[PDB]
Write a protein that holds these residues in place. Structure first.
Motif, PDB file in Angstrom:
ATOM      1  N   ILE A   1       3.793  21.312 -17.729  1.00  0.00           N
ATOM      2  CA  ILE A   1       4.505  20.356 -18.593  1.00  0.00           C
ATOM      3  C   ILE A   1       6.006  21.141 -18.846  1.00  0.00           C
ATOM      4  O   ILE A   1       6.935  20.463 -18.327  1.00  0.00           O
ATOM      5  CB  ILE A   1       3.867  20.412 -20.225  1.00  0.00           C
ATOM      6  CG1 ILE A   1       2.415  19.906 -19.875  1.00  0.00           C
ATOM      7  CG2 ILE A   1       4.499  19.304 -20.820  1.00  0.00           C
ATOM      8  CD1 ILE A   1       1.557  20.571 -21.043  1.00  0.00           C
ATOM      9  N   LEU A   2       6.327  21.892 -19.526  1.00  0.00           N
ATOM     10  CA  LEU A   2       7.453  22.446 -20.167  1.00  0.00           C
ATOM     11  C   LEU A   2       8.419  22.739 -18.736  1.00  0.00           C
ATOM     12  O   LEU A   2       9.629  22.528 -18.842  1.00  0.00           O
ATOM     13  CB  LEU A   2       7.387  23.893 -20.802  1.00  0.00           C
ATOM     14  CG  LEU A   2       6.265  23.857 -21.908  1.00  0.00           C
ATOM     15  CD1 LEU A   2       5.941  25.356 -22.171  1.00  0.00           C
ATOM     16  CD2 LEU A   2       6.361  23.139 -22.950  1.00  0.00           C
TER      17      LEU A   2
ATOM     18  N   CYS B   1      -5.647  25.220 -19.147  1.00  0.00           N
ATOM     19  CA  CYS B   1      -4.945  24.703 -20.454  1.00  0.00           C
ATOM     20  C   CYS B   1      -3.760  25.633 -20.386  1.00  0.00           C
ATOM     21  O   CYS B   1      -2.608  24.990 -20.773  1.00  0.00           O
ATOM     22  CB  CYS B   1      -5.783  25.255 -21.659  1.00  0.00           C
ATOM     23  SG  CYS B   1      -7.072  24.400 -22.222  1.00  0.00           S
TER      24      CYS B   1
ATOM     25  N   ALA C   1       9.160  19.693 -17.241  1.00  0.00           N
ATOM     26  CA  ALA C   1       9.950  18.705 -18.136  1.00  0.00           C
ATOM     27  C   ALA C   1      11.157  19.315 -18.589  1.00  0.00           C
ATOM     28  O   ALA C   1      11.966  18.603 -19.471  1.00  0.00           O
ATOM     29  CB  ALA C   1       8.797  18.646 -19.537  1.00  0.00           C
TER      30      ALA C   1
ATOM     31  N   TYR D   1      -8.576  16.840 -24.896  1.00  0.00           N
ATOM     32  CA  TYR D   1      -7.406  16.878 -25.302  1.00  0.00           C
ATOM     33  C   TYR D   1      -6.011  17.730 -24.664  1.00  0.00           C
ATOM     34  O   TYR D   1      -5.118  17.306 -24.466  1.00  0.00           O
ATOM     35  CB  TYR D   1      -7.201  17.464 -26.976  1.00  0.00           C
ATOM     36  CG  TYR D   1      -8.414  17.318 -27.619  1.00  0.00           C
ATOM     37  CD1 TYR D   1      -9.198  18.667 -27.981  1.00  0.00           C
ATOM     38  CD2 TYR D   1      -9.041  16.203 -28.074  1.00  0.00           C
ATOM     39  CE1 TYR D   1     -10.522  18.279 -28.758  1.00  0.00           C
ATOM     40  CE2 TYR D   1     -10.291  15.865 -28.696  1.00  0.00           C
ATOM     41  CZ  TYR D   1     -11.078  17.160 -28.946  1.00  0.00           C
ATOM     42  OH  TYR D   1     -12.386  16.742 -29.682  1.00  0.00           O
TER      43      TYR D   1
ATOM     44  N   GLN E   1     -10.143  27.350 -20.362  1.00  0.00           N
ATOM     45  CA  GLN E   1      -9.093  27.621 -21.116  1.00  0.00           C
ATOM     46  C   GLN E   1      -7.782  27.999 -20.168  1.00  0.00           C
ATOM     47  O   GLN E   1      -6.564  28.111 -20.917  1.00  0.00           O
ATOM     48  CB  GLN E   1      -9.638  28.733 -22.159  1.00  0.00           C
ATOM     49  CG  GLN E   1     -10.478  28.513 -23.074  1.00  0.00           C
ATOM     50  CD  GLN E   1     -10.591  29.474 -24.159  1.00  0.00           C
ATOM     51  OE1 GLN E   1     -10.485  30.684 -23.712  1.00  0.00           O
ATOM     52  NE2 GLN E   1     -11.084  29.390 -25.418  1.00  0.00           N
TER      53      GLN E   1
ATOM     54  N   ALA F   1      -0.162  23.466 -19.385  1.00  0.00           N
ATOM     55  CA  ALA F   1       0.703  23.766 -20.711  1.00  0.00           C
ATOM     56  C   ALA F   1       2.038  24.156 -20.363  1.00  0.00           C
ATOM     57  O   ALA F   1       2.955  24.012 -20.762  1.00  0.00           O
ATOM     58  CB  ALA F   1       0.025  24.661 -21.895  1.00  0.00           C
TER      59      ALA F   1
ATOM     60  N   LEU G   1      -5.813  15.831 -21.152  1.00  0.00           N
ATOM     61  CA  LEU G   1      -5.387  14.126 -20.895  1.00  0.00           C
ATOM     62  C   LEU G   1      -4.060  14.150 -21.724  1.00  0.00           C
ATOM     63  O   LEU G   1      -3.026  13.880 -21.052  1.00  0.00           O
ATOM     64  CB  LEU G   1      -6.321  13.377 -21.696  1.00  0.00           C
ATOM     65  CG  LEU G   1      -7.551  13.970 -22.366  1.00  0.00           C
ATOM     66  CD1 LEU G   1      -7.729  12.810 -23.598  1.00  0.00           C
ATOM     67  CD2 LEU G   1      -8.601  13.955 -21.504  1.00  0.00           C
ATOM     68  N   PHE G   2      -3.915  14.718 -22.856  1.00  0.00           N
ATOM     69  CA  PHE G   2      -2.739  14.648 -23.715  1.00  0.00           C
ATOM     70  C   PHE G   2      -1.584  15.706 -23.285  1.00  0.00           C
ATOM     71  O   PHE G   2      -0.379  15.133 -23.269  1.00  0.00           O
ATOM     72  CB  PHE G   2      -3.009  15.185 -25.149  1.00  0.00           C
ATOM     73  CG  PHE G   2      -1.672  15.871 -26.008  1.00  0.00           C
ATOM     74  CD1 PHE G   2      -1.474  15.628 -26.975  1.00  0.00           C
ATOM     75  CD2 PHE G   2      -1.186  16.856 -25.268  1.00  0.00           C
ATOM     76  CE1 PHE G   2      -0.500  16.385 -27.854  1.00  0.00           C
ATOM     77  CE2 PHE G   2      -0.082  17.637 -25.761  1.00  0.00           C
ATOM     78  CZ  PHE G   2       0.379  17.326 -27.242  1.00  0.00           C
ATOM     79  N   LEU G   3      -2.035  16.594 -22.586  1.00  0.00           N
ATOM     80  CA  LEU G   3      -0.912  17.620 -21.985  1.00  0.00           C
ATOM     81  C   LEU G   3      -0.530  16.951 -20.607  1.00  0.00           C
ATOM     82  O   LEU G   3       0.694  16.749 -20.295  1.00  0.00           O
ATOM     83  CB  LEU G   3      -1.303  18.991 -21.661  1.00  0.00           C
ATOM     84  CG  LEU G   3      -1.539  19.956 -22.904  1.00  0.00           C
ATOM     85  CD1 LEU G   3      -1.780  21.384 -22.522  1.00  0.00           C
ATOM     86  CD2 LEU G   3      -0.208  20.301 -23.731  1.00  0.00           C
TER      87      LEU G   3
ATOM     88  N   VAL H   1       1.826  13.188 -21.460  1.00  0.00           N
ATOM     89  CA  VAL H   1       3.292  13.733 -21.791  1.00  0.00           C
ATOM     90  C   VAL H   1       3.914  13.743 -20.351  1.00  0.00           C
ATOM     91  O   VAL H   1       4.841  13.227 -20.100  1.00  0.00           O
ATOM     92  CB  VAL H   1       3.418  14.854 -22.571  1.00  0.00           C
ATOM     93  CG1 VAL H   1       4.875  14.578 -23.289  1.00  0.00           C
ATOM     94  CG2 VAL H   1       2.325  15.380 -23.328  1.00  0.00           C
TER      95      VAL H   1
END
Ligand SMILES: N[C@H](CCC(=O)N[C@@H](CS)C(=O)NCC(=O)O)C(=O)O
Ligand SMILES: N[C@H](CCC(=O)N[C@@H](CS)C(=O)NCC(=O)O)C(=O)O
Ligand SMILES: N[C@H](CCC(=O)N[C@@H](CS)C(=O)NCC(=O)O)C(=O)O
Lengths: 142, 142, 142
Positions: free
Chosen positions: C134-135, C127, C138, C70, C124, C131, C73-75, C78
């Motif tokens: 992304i931001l 992670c 993004a 999760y 982790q 995470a 892949l999901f992070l 996006v």
């Protein structure tokens, strides 16, 4: 309007899933009553303390963040790379993350599964809102 | 060609991840066979009228709805927004799924595992078909 | 060069979530000493050679396969269709897997859990850096 409605889907659902992953388990490996009355592990339920509220929590806390996430990830996601709409998206992050967290938190404290009553449906019902909003749009694109 | 194809792949898995869960939620909890022998809520292996089917039944569904999902969503989507092909897209949704649903109601009804043994094989291979049909597109691009 | 990073994202994690889902069922349903001392199934814990390592390992690999997916892949999805960078998305894809494989396998082996404490932080922390990546990026696409 698109790409941004997605940014926070990272930040927020990380917290939701993988920070609740990092808290739970990290808090667990320190509190370790394991090596329980001399054991190889597995089997959760020697003392109440050890596993009774934890084995639920570890399962539940994982359960909650497991269950919502995918429906809110992919249904959105494969709709999200198609040219979708603002307001619409934003309210799912408010129905899912708030639908889940009041779902997750209520079901961790009070032991009783019936408490998972009210929010469990608030999680189920933006899946009636998400899924269709894909269907009419994608069908509109072609 | 591409976006109609990954189109109906939301709806198959809102009924399959989330219609099934909703029912296995809804009917489980209406006839709520909990508030057991005056119990703080956990457990699930005393009364056959209470859990045996349900505890199987409910975790049967989730366990099936999760597992094949992962490598269908992830696997497909790294390869969707990339440039796909139709009869191949369109089998993977039907091969995977009818590879799953006759795996999922099989293991459901009749308790004995043997049942899941064929259709689960009918779904596993699709993760390889996808795997190779994904990787070649992934090789044409480079 | 985006997809370059991404093409073995899909595949290597087949080795993780579904080539491991595969052998573990292929192998189990097969070796299976189910029909357990006269049994309509559910409940997997009488004799060790039959239940204890099986039910564990089955689920030991599984639960571990589940949780790396999760965030990864999901992070990674996006922030993917968006304009990222190879090195970056190469660091995140590599370290996670080589961090989660040592994690899954460890636990998998010596029945005990404490052997998992190590690489799951090495899982982790990616992670934590994925995470953010992304931001940050993004925020640079707006
Ligand atoms: N509550 C923690 C979640 C922490 C977590 O996300 N751990 C992942 C990788 S960091 C895992 O595979 N842990 C399984 C384990 O407890 O051994 C747990 O015990 O699982
Ligand atoms: N039958 C449900 C599966 C449907 C489902 O995904 N329900 C979610 C959405 S409310 C849930 O949080 N269930 C709460 C729970 O049983 O722990 C279940 O046992 O969980
Ligand atoms: N060891 C196997 C792994 C094989 C597997 O990934 N099984 C999934 C995907 S077909 C499933 O639907 N399991 C149902 C079952 O275990 O009977 C297992 O117990 O599940």
């Amino acid at each position: 309007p698109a790409l941004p409605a997605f940014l926070l889907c990272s930040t927020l659902l990380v917290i939701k899933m993988y920070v609740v992953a990092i808290i739970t388990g990290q808090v667990r490996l320190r509190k370790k009553a394991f090596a329980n009355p001399e054991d190889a592990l597995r089997h959760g339920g020697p003392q109440y303390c050890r596993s009774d509220p934890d084995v639920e929590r570890c399962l539940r806390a994982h359960r909650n963040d497991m269950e919502t996430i995918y429906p809110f990830l992919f249904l959105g996601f494969v709709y999200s790379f198609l040219g979708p709409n603002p307001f619409v998206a934003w309210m799912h992050f408010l129905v899912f993350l708030v639908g889940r967290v009041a779902h997750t938190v209520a079901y961790l404290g009070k032991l009783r599964a019936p408490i998972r009553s009210v929010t469990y449906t608030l999680a189920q019902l933006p899946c009636a809102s998400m899924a269709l909003q894909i269907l009419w749009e994608a069908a509109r694109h072609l």
